[PDB]
Amino acid sequence: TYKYVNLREPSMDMKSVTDRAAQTLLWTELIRGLGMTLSYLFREPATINYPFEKGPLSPRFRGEHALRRYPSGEERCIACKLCEAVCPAQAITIEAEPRADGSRRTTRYDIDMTKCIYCGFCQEACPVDAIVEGPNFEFSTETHEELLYNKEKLLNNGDKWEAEIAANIQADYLYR
Amino acid sequence: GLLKKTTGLVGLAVCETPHERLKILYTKILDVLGHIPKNAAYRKYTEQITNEKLSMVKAEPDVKKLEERLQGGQIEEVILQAENELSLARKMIQWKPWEPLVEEPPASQWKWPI
Amino acid sequence: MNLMLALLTNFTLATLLVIIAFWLPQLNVYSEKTSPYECGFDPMGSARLPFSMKFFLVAITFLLFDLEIALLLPLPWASQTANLNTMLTMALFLIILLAVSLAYEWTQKGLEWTE
Amino acid sequence: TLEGIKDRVLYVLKLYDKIDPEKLSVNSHFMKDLGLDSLDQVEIIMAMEDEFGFEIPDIDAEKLMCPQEIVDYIAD
Amino acid sequence: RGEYVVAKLDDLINWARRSSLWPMTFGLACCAVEMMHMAAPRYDMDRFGVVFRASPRQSDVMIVAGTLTNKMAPALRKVYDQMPEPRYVVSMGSCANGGGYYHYSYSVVRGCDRIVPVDIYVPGCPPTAEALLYGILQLQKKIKREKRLRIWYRR
Amino acid sequence: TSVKPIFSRDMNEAKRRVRELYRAWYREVPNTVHLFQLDISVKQGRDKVREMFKKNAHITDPRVVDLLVIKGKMELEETIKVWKQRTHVMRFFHETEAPRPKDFLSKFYVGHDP
Amino acid sequence: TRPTVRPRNDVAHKQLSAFGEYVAEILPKYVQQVQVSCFNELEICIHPDGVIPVLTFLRDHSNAQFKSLADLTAVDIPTRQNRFEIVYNLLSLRFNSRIRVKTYTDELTPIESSVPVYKAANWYEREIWDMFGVFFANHPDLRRILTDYGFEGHPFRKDFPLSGYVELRYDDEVKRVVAEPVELAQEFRKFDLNSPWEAFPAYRQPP
Amino acid sequence: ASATRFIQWLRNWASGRDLQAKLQLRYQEISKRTQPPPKLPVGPSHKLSNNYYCTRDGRREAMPPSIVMSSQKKAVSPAPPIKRWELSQDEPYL
Ligand SMILES: CCCCCCCCCCCCCCCCCC(=O)OC[C@H](COP(=O)([O-])OCC[N+](C)(C)C)OC(=O)CCCCCCCCCCCCCCCCC
Ligand SMILES: CCCCCCCCCCCCCCCCCC(=O)OC[C@H](COP(=O)(O)OCCN)OC(=O)CCCCCCCCCCCCCCCCC
Ligand SMILES: CCCCCCCCCCCCO[C@@H]1O[C@H](CO)[C@@H](O[C@H]2O[C@H](CO)[C@@H](O)[C@H](O)[C@H]2O)[C@H](O)[C@H]1O
Ligand SMILES: CCCCCCCCCCCCO[C@@H]1O[C@H](CO)[C@@H](O[C@H]2O[C@H](CO)[C@@H](O)[C@H](O)[C@H]2O)[C@H](O)[C@H]1O
Ligand code: SF4
Ligand code: SF4
Ligand code: SF4
Query: In chain C, where does DSSP find H-type helix?
Result: 2-23, 31-34, 56-72, 75-78, 84-107
- Ligand 2 mean position, distance from CA C84 (Å): 32
Report the alpha-carbon distance of residue G125 to residue G42 in Å, rounded: 23
Cβ burial of C82 (10 Å; 0-12, 13-18, 19+) is exposed
CA distances from G15 to B41, E133, G10, G37, G39 (A): 19, 58, 8, 13, 13
Cite the beta strand spans of chain F per DSSP E. Answer: none
Class assignment of domain C7-107?
Answer: mainly alpha
CA-nearest of E137, F92, E104, F63 to G164 is E104
Other CB atoms within 10 A of residue D73 CB: 18
Q: Is A88 helix (H, G, I), strand (E, B) or coil?
A: coil
The CA distance from A27 to A33, in Å, is: 10
Whether the Cβ atoms of residue G144 and residue G151 lie closer than 8 Å to each other: yes
Q: Which residues pair with G90 in a beta bridge?
A: G69, G99
According to the annotation, is E30 in a ligand binding site?
yes
Q: Is A70 in the pocket of ligand 5 (CB under 6 A)?
A: no
In this structure, what DSSP letter does residue A19 have? Answer: H
Q: How many other CB atoms sit within 10 Å of the CB of residue C80?
A: 8
Counting ligands in written order, which one lies closest to the CA of residue C110?
4
Of G143, E55, F31, nearest in space to C44 by CA:
F31
| Total domains, chain F | 1
In short, whether E148's Cβ falls inside 6 Å of ligand 1 is yes
3-state secondary structure of G70: strand
Burial G85-105 (b: 16+ CB within 10 A, else e): bbebbbbbebbebbbbbbbbb
Distance E93 CA to ligand 7 centre (A): 6
* C111 Cα: distance to centroid of ligand 1 (angstroms): 54
Residue A112 CA to residue A90 CA, distance in Å, equals: 9
| Catalytic residue check, D37 | yes
Dist. CA C105 → ligand 3 center (Å): 29
Q: Is A122 annotated as a binding residue?
A: yes
- Least Cα distance to A157 among A170, A142, A144, A147 occurs for A147
Return the half-sphere exposure (C-beta side, CA atoms, 13 A cut-off) of residue A147: 30
Residue-wise DSSP of E58-107: G-SEEEEES--BTTTHHHHHHHHHTS-SS-EEEEEHHHHHH-GGGTT-TT
Q: Whose CA is nearest to atom 13 of ligand 4?
A: C107
Q: Out of E77, E82, E85, whose CB is closest to C28?
A: E85
| Omega before residue B113 within 30° of 0, cis | yes
As to burial, measured by CB atoms within 10 angstroms (0-12 exposed, 13-18 middle, 19+ buried), residue G61 is: buried
Report the SS3 class of residue F41. coil
- Half-sphere exposure (Cβ direction) of C6: Cα atoms closer than 13 Å: 3
A162 phi, psi to nearest 5 deg: -60, -35
Which one is catalytic: D20, D37, D60, D72?
D37
CA–CA dist A136, A113 (Å, integer): 13
- The residue in chain G having the minimum alpha-carbon distance to the alpha carbon of residue C30 is G175
Nearest ligand to the CA atom of A82: 6
Q: State how beta strands G84-92 and G97-105 pair.
A: antiparallel
CA dist., res. G76 & res. G134, Å (int): 11
Strand E120-122 and strand H66-70: the pairing is unpaired
| Phi, psi values for residue A170, rounded to 5° | -55, -40
| Exposed e or buried b per residue across D11-49, where buried means at least 16 C-beta atoms within 10 angstroms of its C-beta | ebbeebeebeeeebeeebebeeebebebbbbbbbbeebe
Distances (CA, A) of F77 to C40, D21, F41, F84: 20, 37, 21, 9
CA F101 to chain centre: 23
List the alpha helices (DSSP H) in B2-98. 18-33, 41-59, 63-70, 75-95
Q: CA A1 to CA G153: how far, in whole Å?
A: 50
Cβ atoms within 10 Å, residue A133: 21
Domain encompassing residue F80: 1-114
Instruction: Tell me how far apart the alpha carbons of residues G24 and G42 are, in angstroms, rounded to a whole number.
Output: 12
Inter-chain CB proximity C42 and F81 less than 8 Å: no
Measured between alpha carbons, how far is A115 from E125 in angstroms, rounded to an integer?
A: 9
Q: Return all residues near B18 (Cβ < 8 A) that are at least 6 apart.
A: B63, B66, B75, B76, B78, B79
**E114 near E122, Cβ under 8 Å?**
no
Cα–Cα distance measured from residue A160 to residue H47, given in angstroms and rounded to the nearest whole number: 43
Given ligand 2 and candidates A18, A19, A20, A25, which is best to mutate, with the most ligand atoms within 8 Å of its CB? A25
* Residues belonging to chain C: 115
Nearest Cβ partner for G188 among A85, A90, A93? A90
| G73: helix, strand or coil | strand
Tell me which chain D residue has its CA closest to the CA of residue F46.
D43
**What is the rounded distance in angstroms from the CA atom of residue G108 to the CA atom of residue F61?**
10
Which of ligand 2's atoms lies nearest the C-alpha of A34? 43
E95 is in an annotated binding site: yes
d(CA G14, CA G40): 9
Q: Is the distance from CB of G33 to CB of H71 less than 8 angstroms?
A: yes
Using alpha carbons, list the distances in angstroms from residue A79 to A73, A152, A160, F42: 17, 15, 22, 62
Whether A47 contacts E44, CB under 8 Å: yes
Atom of ligand 2 nearest to the CA of A30: 42
**Which of G11, G41, G97, G102 to mutate against chain H (most H CBs within 10 Å)?**
G97
Nearest CA to ligand 1 atom 25: E152
Cis-peptide, bond into residue F101, ω within 30° of zero? no
The domain ranges of chain C are: 7-107
CA G91/CA G88 separation, integer angstroms: 10
Closest CA to G50 of G29, G66, G25: G29
CA distance A135 to A169: 11
E74 contacts in chain F (CB < 8 Å): 85, 87-88
| Secondary structure of residue E121 in the 3-state scheme | strand
